[PDB]
Design a protein around this ligand. Structure first.
Ligand code: CL
Lengths: 124, 121
């Protein structure tokens, strides 16, 4: 995998959208001491080239960091090609509002939280 | 995943690092997070890991400015995973780096040693 550079856009290309769609995404947040945290998120989807969404089922450290104001970094990597894309995003969390209810009605996790991610920057 | 109150990997956690793709995360000096895969990650002992920095990209720049380093080794199908928080020591072309890289095709990479501060699972 190559070093990534800032692409000076907040819009994914189609190839990058397909990276996010087709691979297990990893997400990183920042804890209360300013340290990183990282873990996999299987429920990631792409709403449009500047917005992603996932379900927060565990409500663990990532969620607590986000609730405390952390920004979110995401990566989607394709090992066979060694291609990857990363984003920096701000999180918009929907716990039990009508938007959450609408989104979750299409899933089997009615008590999850719906986290939308507004892409600020793309790196590749 | 919860703090285990140790800086030492268990045998199961060593195997998780050995058998799965590891992801690394850092923060820039303003606190914005970064995350990416690290295929060269290796456990040296229960409290130390090591990887190669071949590209010297954003994780590198963040570490240079003092970022601590988070790692995860997840076997997602098996529902097992381990996370660490560590500090880095960067070896660019000292005798240690040379010794390590002699066993690789990457003689100009930097060697980054990670000292585990906390394990989570
Ligand atoms: Cl495109």
């Amino acid at each position: 995998f190559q070093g990534m550079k800032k692409l000076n856009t907040n819009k994914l290309t189609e190839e990058q959208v397909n990276l996010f769609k087709n691979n297990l995404v990893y997400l990183a947040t920042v804890d209360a001491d300013g340290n990183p945290q990282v873990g996999p998120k299987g429920s990631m989807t792409v709403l449009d080239p500047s917005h992603l969404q996932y379900l927060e089922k565990t409500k663990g450290e990532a969620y607590e960091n986000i609730k405390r104001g952390s920004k979110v970094a995401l990566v989607a990597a394709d090992v066979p090609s060694h291609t990857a894309v990363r984003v920096l995003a701000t999180a918009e969390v929907h716990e039990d509002d009508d938007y959450a209810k609408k989104v979750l009605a299409k899933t089997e996790f009615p008590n999850a939280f719906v986290v939308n991610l507004n892409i600020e920057e793309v790196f590749a």
